[PDB]
From Swiss-Prot, chain A:
Gene that this polypeptide is encoded by: INTS11
Pfam families the record matches: Beta-Casp (PF10996), IntS11_C (PF21386), Lactamase_B_6 (PF16661), RMMBL (PF07521)
Catalytic activity, EC: 3.1.27.-
Organism from which the protein derives: Homo sapiens (Human)
Subunit structure: Component of the Integrator complex, composed of core subunits INTS1, INTS2, INTS3, INTS4, INTS5, INTS6, INTS7, INTS8, INTS9/RC74, INTS10, INTS11/CPSF3L, INTS12, INTS13, INTS14 and INTS15. The core complex associates with protein phosphatase 2A subunits PPP2CA and PPP2R1A, to form the Integrator-PP2A (INTAC) complex. INTS11 is part of the RNA endonuclease subcomplex, composed of INTS4, INTS9, INTS11 and inositol hexakisphosphate (InsP6). Interacts with WDR73; interaction is required for the assembly of the RNA endonuclease subcomplex in the cytoplasm.
Protein name, per record: Integrator complex subunit 11
PTM (free text): Sumoylated; sumoylation regulates its subcellular location and is required for integrator complex integrity.
Curated annotation (Swiss-Prot), chain B:
Regions crossing the membrane: none
Region feature (Cleavage module binding motif (CMBM)): 1-35
Known tissue expression: Widely expressed. Tends to be up-regulated in seminomas compared to normal testis.
Gene encoding the protein: INTS13
Subcellular location(s) of the protein: Nucleus; Cytoplasm
Protein's organism: Homo sapiens
Coverage span on the entire protein: 655 to 689 of 706
PTM-bearing positions, type Phosphoserine: S24
Subunit structure: Component of the Integrator complex, composed of core subunits INTS1, INTS2, INTS3, INTS4, INTS5, INTS6, INTS7, INTS8, INTS9/RC74, INTS10, INTS11/CPSF3L, INTS12, INTS13, INTS14 and INTS15. The core complex associates with protein phosphatase 2A subunits PPP2CA and PPP2R1A, to form the Integrator-PP2A (INTAC) complex. INTS13 is part of the tail subcomplex, composed of INTS10, INTS13, INTS14 and INTS15. Interacts with transcription factors ZNF609 and ZNF655. Interacts with PAFAH1B1; this interaction may be required for proper recruitment of dynein complexes to the nuclear envelope at prophase.
Family classification: Belongs to the Integrator subunit 13 family.
Name of protein: Integrator complex subunit 13
Its job: Component of the integrator complex, a multiprotein complex that terminates RNA polymerase II (Pol II) transcription in the promoter-proximal region of genes.
Domain notes: The cleavage module binding motif (CMBM) mediates recruitment of transcription factors.
Swiss-Prot record, chain C:
Cellular location(s): Nucleus; Cytoplasm
PANTHER family documented for this protein: INTEGRATOR COMPLEX SUBUNIT 9
GO cellular component entries: cytoplasm; cytosol; INTAC complex; integrator complex; nucleoplasm; nucleus
Family indicated by similarity: Belongs to the metallo-beta-lactamase superfamily. RNA-metabolizing metallo-beta-lactamase-like family. INTS9 subfamily.
Annotated organism of origin: Homo sapiens (Human)
Designated name of the protein: Integrator complex subunit 9
Subunit structure: Component of the Integrator complex, composed of core subunits INTS1, INTS2, INTS3, INTS4, INTS5, INTS6, INTS7, INTS8, INTS9/RC74, INTS10, INTS11/CPSF3L, INTS12, INTS13, INTS14 and INTS15. The core complex associates with protein phosphatase 2A subunits PPP2CA and PPP2R1A, to form the Integrator-PP2A (INTAC) complex. INTS9 is part of the RNA endonuclease subcomplex, composed of INTS4, INTS9, INTS11 and inositol hexakisphosphate (InsP6). Interacts with WDR73; interaction is required for the assembly of the RNA endonuclease subcomplex in the cytoplasm.
C-alpha cells in the first residue's frame, strides 16, 4: 500500500499549478495551471514528464479542474490538444461556461504579443471543450470501476469547487482556491467530516468595514458629481462590486447612472444570472421576487469617449493594451477627474482568497492525518506549516516543484459477517468477551463464517482437545466442587449468572464437571476441554491456584 | 501471511509509469531539461 | 424487510420501508381526486351555483347540492390524505422526495403527526413544490368557504348516496387545506441533495437519487446496504424530453424493486396527442374561438408551449396572444430557465453558448408571450377576446380556470382542452355539465408506459418487483387488453391501500472493516484454496463494525503417517492390535490411551511440560487453522 504524489509547479510558488497523483495506479490529473511572464514557453507543465511523446490517454484516465482562473486552467488547451489527449475530463458546468471565452481572450492577448508561434488555437479549444464532460455539485460520479469523483462547493468564484477523491478506504482531497469568508454574492466553502488521508490546500495568505468605506467614497464622488472608474480584470470581484453598488443605489433610491463597458462583462452577467444555485442565499431567495442581476444600472455605450463625465460608475477591463484604452485619454487631466484603482487613490481590492485562519478552520474541520501545501509564497507556507505543527502535532508536507511525496496507507480488508454471530456479539457487548474469527478465501473476495455455519461446507471433522488436570487431596469431591464454585464466583466478580443441572459451572466456553477416574481408585482425575484462547486463560488460572491457596 | 498475499494482489494491480519519477533522485524533478 | 403502503393511488405513492435499523418514508403523494366530489370555488360567486338545487335528506337540504343527476358537496374542497394512522409517523426518520407532485401533503405529515426526522429532495423539486403549494393555498384562500357539510361523511349517508360518492374510500380521513405558515414550517426541515449524491444515514444505510428523466428535478431513489440494495422507481421518461436523460445502469443488480408512477391511460401517444391538441387550437382560432388549457406550471406546460410555438410558427398563426395566468407564473418560467444543469444534453449544449436554454425568453423580450399573476393584476386591461389561456388547477374545483370556463361555458365557439392525465374529465365536467362548450380530452403522459417498464425490467432483471394491485389488473376501461399487463418471471406481488408487505429478501450478512495486523496474523496452508483463522475484539460506532486486536482446531491426522511418526520417535511399549469397534491401543509410556471410533474422537494429554511440548509440535506439523 503506497500513495504516490509529485506535484509540479506552484508547490513553493504561485501559478503553473499541476498536481499529478497515482493513488492506486490510477493517474488523476487534479489541475493544469500556468504563470504569465514565462516568455520562454515555461507557462505550461512538462508533458514529457509523463513520457516522451505518446498518448496521454494511455497514462491518464481522469482530469480535474478547480475553476476558470488561468492559474488553474490556463495550460489545458495545449496540453489536451497539441500533446494529444482525448480521455475523460471532469469539471463543473459553470466553469465550462466561463472558461472558453477567457481562454480565447487570453490567446488573443498572447497574439498581440506575437508569441503565438507555438500557442493555442480557437478551433482546438472548441474541439477539446466539446469533448469535456461536465459535473454537478456533489455529483458522486463513478469515473472508473473503483475510482469515484465527488465535488464540494468552494465559493472562491462562481463555479469553483473542491474535489473529494476516494478509492476503497483511500481518500484524497484537493481544493485549490477557496475561502471561509463568504462573498457578497457567493457562499462559503462547506464540506462534511470527510477525514481524508491527505489534503491539498493553498497557502497564499474588516471586509464589511472596507465595503462601507468603498461605498461611502463612491457615494461622496457621485454626490459631488465626480467621475471615477474601477479598472479591474477579475470577473468575480467585478460582479461582486456590481451587485454591491446596485443594491446600494437601490437602497438609497437615487437614480444616479452606473454602467459597464466590455461585452465580456455582459457575457459574464448572462452566465451569472443563468447559474443561480452557485451564489449566495439572498440571491436564491430574491430570485422568487424578481431577477437581481438585472437593473437600470445597465450597459455602456458612452458615445465612444464623447458622453462627458458626471456622477458615473464605470468598469473597464484592459489587458497590457486591451479594451477601450482611450478611456484614460477622455477622462483624467485634473484633480476632479479622479481615477481610482487598487484625485486620490485607495486599495479597494477585496481578498477573494481567505487568510491563514480560514485554512486553520478547514483543516480543523476535516482533520486529515496528512496535509499538503501548494500555491502560495514560500514564507507563508513555511509559517503556516510551523503553526500547524505547533497547534495540532499533525503531520504535514512542504513539497517543492517536482518534489516526490510518498505516504503510507492502511488498506482496510472488506469482508462479510454472519448475522447470528454479530447479533450474539452485540448482545454480549451490551451486557470483556472477545469474538473469534474464521474466514475462507473466496473468488476475488473474502468472507467470515461462524463455526456452526462453517460446518455447512460438507466434510467437517471436528477435533477437540481435552487436557487432564491432576490434584492430590484427601477431601471429598462434591464439597470441594462447591468450594471451588464459590471461590471462582467470588474471584470472577459475578460474571457467572448461569448454571448447569449436573452440578457443573461454566465460564465463557469451558466446562467444569466431576468425572470418576478410569480404573485407579487411589487417584482422582477430572477432564477439562477448551480451545487455545481458553487454554491460555485456564493455564494461567491453574498456575495462580497452584501458587497459593488456603490448603 | 494473508496480509502478505493481499498486498501482493494489490501490488499486482499495476499500470504504466512516468520516466521522471524513475529518474527522480532527491525527490525534486526537472522540468524542461533542454532549457 | 417490512414495507408499509399507505396510499392506494397508483401515481401518488405513500410507502414506508422498514430497512434494517432504519425506516424510510418513501413519498407523501396527496390524492387530489377527492376534491372532484365537492362544489367548485368560483373567484366571483356565480348566479348558477347560488340557484343550484339542493338534494333530499330524510334526517335539511342545504348540506348537499345536485347537478346533472350527480350530488356534489356544497362546502370547501377537502383532500384525501394517505392512511397515516397505520404506522406511527413519529418513528420514521427519513423522507425521500421523488418529484414535486409526490411531495404534496408533506405539511400534514411534518406538522400534524409530530414527525421530527429529516427530509431530502432535489432543488428544482423543492422550488416547484413551493410554487405549487403556495398557488393552491392561494386558490383556496382567495374566496374562503365554510366547512358547512360534515354529516354527509357518515357511512350510512354514503350508502344512501349514489355511486359517484359511494365509490369514495376513507372519506373520514379527508382534511381541509393547510396554510402557508404550515408550508413554511414544513419546508424548513428539508435538505437539498443533487443527482447521484450518496447520503449516509447513521453509518448504516446509503441512499442516492438518480435522474428519473420525467421532469426537471424529478429523481428515482435507491437504498443500499452493500450486501442488500433496494431500488425505488417513480415517474420516469425515456422520451426526448427536456430534463437530464433517464439513468438505467445504476438500477441493475437490485434485490427488491418498487414500481410506481406508470402512465394513466397508457394507450395514448403523447406526440400524437400534442399534434392533435395543436390542430384543435388551430381550428378554434380559425373559427375565432378561445382555448382554455388547465395545467400546472410544471414541465407539461413547458414542452406543450415549446411544441405550440413551433406549430404556430409553422402555420403562421402567431397573431393571437399567449396568456399564462398563475400566482407563480413568472417565478415558474424563470425557475425553469435558470435550472439548466438539470436539463438534457441539447439544453446543456445550448447554455454552453450565452443563450438561455428555453426560447420563450425571446418571446417575452419581444412581448410575444405574456403572463400575469392573476386576472385583476392588469390582465383585464391587456386582455383580448381571441386568445388561448393556460391557468388554474386541472381539477377545475378552484383556481382562475373556474371563472374562465364559467365565462366561456355558454358559447360553443370557444374550446376547452385537457392535458393532465390525473383526473377523469367526465367527473370534472359533471358540475358544469349543461353547456354547449366543446370539450376534448387529450391527456399527455410522458411517464413510462407498460411496454417501456417491461423492457426496463427485462434489461435489468431484478430479483423481485413491488407495485400497486392496479397495475397487476388490466384497466377497467378496457379489461381485455392483455398487452397492457406488467410481465415478470418472478411472481411480482402487489398490494392495496393500507396493506403491509414483507420483503422476500432475507440477506444475513453486512459489512465490517479489518486492519492489516489481523490480516497478517494468518499463516495459510495449501490443501488442494487458502484457509485462515483469527481472533479480534469487536468495536462499533455509528453502525460501523470494526475489528482490531486486543478459533477452532481441526487436526486431521492420517493413521498411517501417525503410526510411522510414532514408531520413528522411539517410544517404548508399542502395541498394535486389530479388534472390533475400531482400533484401540494401550500405551504405558505415560498412561496414555488413544481411541479411534466412527463419528467420535477423544484426545488425552498429560500436564507434563515435555510431553505437552512434544504433542504441540506433533500437532503443529499437521495443523490446519480452521
Ligand atoms: Zn485559484
Ligand atoms: Zn481562484
Amino acid at each position: 500500500p503506497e500513495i504516490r504524489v509529485t506535484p509540479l509547479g506552484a508547490g513553493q510558488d504561485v501559478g503553473r499549478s499541476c498536481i499529478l497523483v497515482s493513488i492506486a495506479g490510477k493517474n488523476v490529473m487534479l489541475d493544469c495551471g500556468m504563470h504569465m511572464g514565462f516568455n520562454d514557453d515555461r507557462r505550461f507543465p512538462d508533458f514529457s514528464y509523463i513520457t516522451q511523446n505518446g498518448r496521454l490517454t494511455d497514462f491518464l484516465d481522469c482530469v480535474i479542474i478547480s475553476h476558470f482562473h488561468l492559474d488553474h486552467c490556463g495550460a489545458l488547451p495545449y496540453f489536451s490538444e497539441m500533446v494529444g489527449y482525448d480521455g475523460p475530463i471532469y469539471m463543473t458546468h459553470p466553469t465550462q461556461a466561463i472558461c472558453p471565452i477567457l481562454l480565447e481572450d487570453y490567446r488573443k492577448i498572447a497574439v498581440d504579443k506575437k508569441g503565438e508561434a507555438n500557442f493555442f488555437t480557437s478551433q482546438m479549444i472548441k474541439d477539446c471543450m466539446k469533448k469535456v464532460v461536465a459535473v454537478h455539485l456533489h455529483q458522486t460520479v463513478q469515473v472508473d470501476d473503483e475510482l469515484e469523483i465527488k465535488a464540494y462547493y468552494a465559493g472562491h468564484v462562481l463555479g469553483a469547487a473542491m474535489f473529494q477523491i476516494k478509492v476503497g478506504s483511500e481518500s484524497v482531497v484537493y481544493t485549490g482556491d477557496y475561502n471561509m469568508t463568504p462573498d457578497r454574492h457567493l457562499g462559503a466553502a462547506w464540506i462534511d467530516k470527510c477525514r481524508p488521508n491527505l489534503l491539498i490546500t493553498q497557502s497564499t495568505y474588516s471586509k464589511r468595514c472596507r465595503e462601507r468605506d468603498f461605498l461611502k467614497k463612491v457615494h461622496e464622488t457621485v454626490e459631488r458629481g465626480g467621475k471615477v472608474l474601477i479598472p479591474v480584470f477579475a470577473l468575480g470581484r467585478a460582479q461582486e462590486l456590481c451587485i454591491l453598488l446596485e443594491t446600494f443605489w437601490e437602497r438609497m433610491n437615487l437614480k444616479v447612472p452606473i454602467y459597464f463597458s466590455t461585452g465580456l462583462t455582459e457575457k459574464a452577467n448572462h452566465y451569472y444570472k443563468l447559474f443561480i444555485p452557485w451564489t449566495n442565499q439572498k440571491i436564491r431567495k430574491t430570485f422568487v421576487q424578481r431577477n437581481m442581476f438585472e437593473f437600470k444600472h445597465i450597459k455602456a455605450f458612452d458615445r465612444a469617449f464623447a458622453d462627458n463625465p458626471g456622477p458615473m460608475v464605470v468598469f473597464a477591463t484592459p489587458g497590457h493594451a486591451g479594451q477601450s484604452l482611450q478611456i484614460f485619454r477622455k477622462w483624467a487631466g485634473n484633480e476632479k477627474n479622479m481615477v481610482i484603482m487598487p484625485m486620490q487613490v485607495e486599495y479597494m481590492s477585496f481578498s477573494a482568497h481567505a487568510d491563514a485562519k480560514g485554512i486553520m478552520q478547514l483543516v480543523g474541520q476535516a482533520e486529515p492525518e496528512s496535509v499538503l501545501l501548494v500555491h502560495g509564497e514560500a514564507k507563508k507556507m513555511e509559517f503556516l506549516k510551523q503553526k500547524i505543527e505547533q497547534e495540532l502535532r499533525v503531520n504535514c508536507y512542504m513539497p517543492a516543484n517536482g518534489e516526490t511525496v510518498t505516504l503510507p496507507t492502511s488498506p482496510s480488508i472488506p469482508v462479510g459477517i454472519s448475522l447470528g454471530l454479530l447479533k450474539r456479539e452485540m448482545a454480549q457487548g451490551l451486557l470483556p468477551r472477545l469474538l473469534h474469527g474464521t474466514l475462507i478465501m473466496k473468488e476475488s473476495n473474502f468472507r467470515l463464517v461462524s463455526s456452526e455455519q462453517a460446518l455447512k461446507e460438507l466434510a467437517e471433522h471436528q477435533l477437540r482437545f481435552t487436557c487432564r488436570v491432576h490434584l492430590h487431596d484427601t477431601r471429598k469431591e462434591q464439597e470441594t466442587a462447591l468450594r471451588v464454585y464459590s471461590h471462582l464466583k467470588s474471584v470472577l466478580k459475578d460474571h457467572c449468572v448461569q448454571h448447569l443441572p449436573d452440578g457443573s459451572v461454566t465460564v465463557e466456553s469451558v466446562l467444569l464437571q466431576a468425572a470418576a477416574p478410569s480404573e485407579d481408585p487411589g487417584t482422582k482425575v477430572l477432564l477439562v476441554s477448551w480451545t487455545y484462547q481458553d487454554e491460555e486463560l485456564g493455564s494461567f488460572l491453574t498456575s495462580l491456584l497452584k501458587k497459593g491457596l488456603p490448603q | 501471511s494473508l496480509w502478505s498475499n493481499r498486498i501482493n494482489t494489490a501490488n499486482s494491480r499495476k499500470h504504466q509509469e512516468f520516466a521522471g519519477r524513475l529518474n527522480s533522485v532527491n525527490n525534486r524533478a526537472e522540468l524542461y531539461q533542454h532549457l | 424487510m417490512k414495507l408499509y403502503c399507505l396510499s392506494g393511488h397508483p401515481t401518488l405513492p405513500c410507502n414506508v420501508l422498514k430497512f434494517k435499523s432504519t425506516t424510510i418514508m418513501l413519498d407523501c403523494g396527496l390524492d387530489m381526486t377527492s376534491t372532484l366530489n365537492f362544489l367548485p370555488l368560483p373567484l366571483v360567486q356565480s348566479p348558477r351555483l347560488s340557484n343550484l338545487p339542493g338534494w333530499s335528506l330524510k334526517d335539511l337540504d342545504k348540506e348537499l347540492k345536485e347537478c346533472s343527476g350527480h350530488v356534489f358537496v356544497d362546502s370547501v374542497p377537502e383532500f384525501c390524505l394517505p392512511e397515516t394512522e397505520l404506522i406511527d409517523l413519529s418513528t420514521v426518520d427519513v423522507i425521500l422526495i421523488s418529484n414535486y407532485h409526490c411531495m404534496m401533503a408533506l405539511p400534514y405529515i411534518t406538522e400534524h403527526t409530530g414527525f421530527t426526522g429529516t427530509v431530502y429532495a432535489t432543488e428544482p423539486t423543492v422550488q416547484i413544490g413551493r410554487l405549487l403549494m403556495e398557488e393552491l393555498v392561494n386558490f383556496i384562500e382567495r374566496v374562503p368557504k365554510a366547512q358547512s357539510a360534515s354529516l354527509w361523511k357518515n357511512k350510512d349517508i354514503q350508502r344512501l348516496l349514489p355511486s359517484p360518492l359511494k365509490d369514495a374510500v376513507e372519506v373520514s380521513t379527508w382534511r381541509r387545506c393547510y396554510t402557508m405558515q404550515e408550508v413554511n414550517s414544513a419546508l424548513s426541515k428539508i435538505q437539498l441533495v443533487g443527482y447521484s449524491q450518496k447520503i449516509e444515514l447513521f453509518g448504516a444505510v446509503q441512499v442516492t437519487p438518480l435522474s428519473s428523466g420525467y421532469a426537471l428535478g424529478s429523481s428515482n431513489w435507491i437504498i443500499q446496504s452493500h450486501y442488500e440494495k433496494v431500488s425505488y422507481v417513480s415517474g420516469s421518461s425515456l422520451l426526448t424530453t427536456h430534463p437530464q436523460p433517464m439513468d438505467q445502469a445504476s438500477l441493475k443488480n437490485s434485490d427488491v424493486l418498487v414500481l410506481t408512477g406508470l402512465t394513466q391511460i397508457p394507450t395514448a401517444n403523447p406526440d400524437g396527442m400534442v399534434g392533435e391538441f395543436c390542430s384543435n387550437l388551430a381550428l378554434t382560432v380559425r373559427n375565432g374561438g378561445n382555448v382554455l388549457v388547465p395545467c400546472y406550471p410544471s414541465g407539461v406546460i413547458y414542452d406543450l408551449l415549446e411544441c405550440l410555438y413551433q406549430y404556430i410558427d409553422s402555420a403562421g398563426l402567431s397573431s393571437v396572444p399567449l396568456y399564462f395566468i398563475s400566482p407563480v407564473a413568472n417565478s415558474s418560467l424563470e425557475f425553469s430557465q435558470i435550472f439548466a444543469e438539470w436539463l438534457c444534453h441539447n439544453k446543456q449544449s445550448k447554455v454552453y453558448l450565452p443563450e438561455p436554454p428555453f426560447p420563450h425568453a425571446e418571446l417575452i423580450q419581444t412581448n410575444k408571450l405574456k403572463h400575469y399573476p392573476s386576472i385583476h393584476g392588469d390582465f383585464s386591461n391587456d386582455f383580448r377576446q381571441p386568445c388561448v389561456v393556460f391557468t388554474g388547477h386541472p381539477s377545475l374545483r378552484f383556481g382562475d380556470v373556474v371563472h374562465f370556463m364559467e365565462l366561456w361555458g355558454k358559447s360553443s365557439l370557444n374550446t376547452v382542452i385537457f392535458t393532465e392525465p390525473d383526473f377523469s374529465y367526465l367527473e370534472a365536467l359533471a358540475p358544469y355539465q349543461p353547456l354547449a362548450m366543446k370539450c376534448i380530452y387529450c391527456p399527455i403522459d410522458t411517464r413510462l408506459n407498460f411496454i417501456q417498464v417491461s423492457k426496463l425490467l427485462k434489461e435489468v432483471q431484478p430479483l423481485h418487483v413491488v407495485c400497486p394491485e392496479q397495475y397487476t389488473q388490466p384497466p377497467p376501461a378496457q379489461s381485455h387488453r392483455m398487452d397492457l399487463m406488467i410481465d415478470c418471471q418472478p411472481p411480482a406481488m402487489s398490494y392495496r391501500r393500507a396493506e403491509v408487505l414483507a420483503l422476500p429478501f432475507k440477506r444475513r450478512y453486512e459489512k465490517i472493516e479489518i486492519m492489516p495486523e489481523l490480516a497478517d496474523s494468518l499463516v495459510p496452508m495449501e490443501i488442494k484454496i487458502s484457509l485462515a483463522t483469527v481472533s479480534a475484539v469487536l468495536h462499533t460506532k455509528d453502525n460501523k463494525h470494526l475489528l482490531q486486536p486486543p478459533p477452532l482446531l481441526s487436526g486431521s491426522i492420517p493413521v498411517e503417517q501417525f503410526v510411522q511418526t510414532l514408531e520413528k520417535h522411539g517410544f517404548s511399549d508399542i502395541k498394535v492390535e486389530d479388534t472390533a469397534k475400531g482400533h484401540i491401543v494401550l500405551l504405558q509410556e505415560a498412561e496414555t490411551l488413544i481411541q479411534i471410533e466412527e463419528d467420535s474422537t477423544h484426545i488425552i494429554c498429560d500436564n507434563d511440560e515435555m510431553l505437552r511440548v512434544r504433542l504441540r509440535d506433533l500437532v503443529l506439523k499437521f495443523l490446519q487453522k480452521f
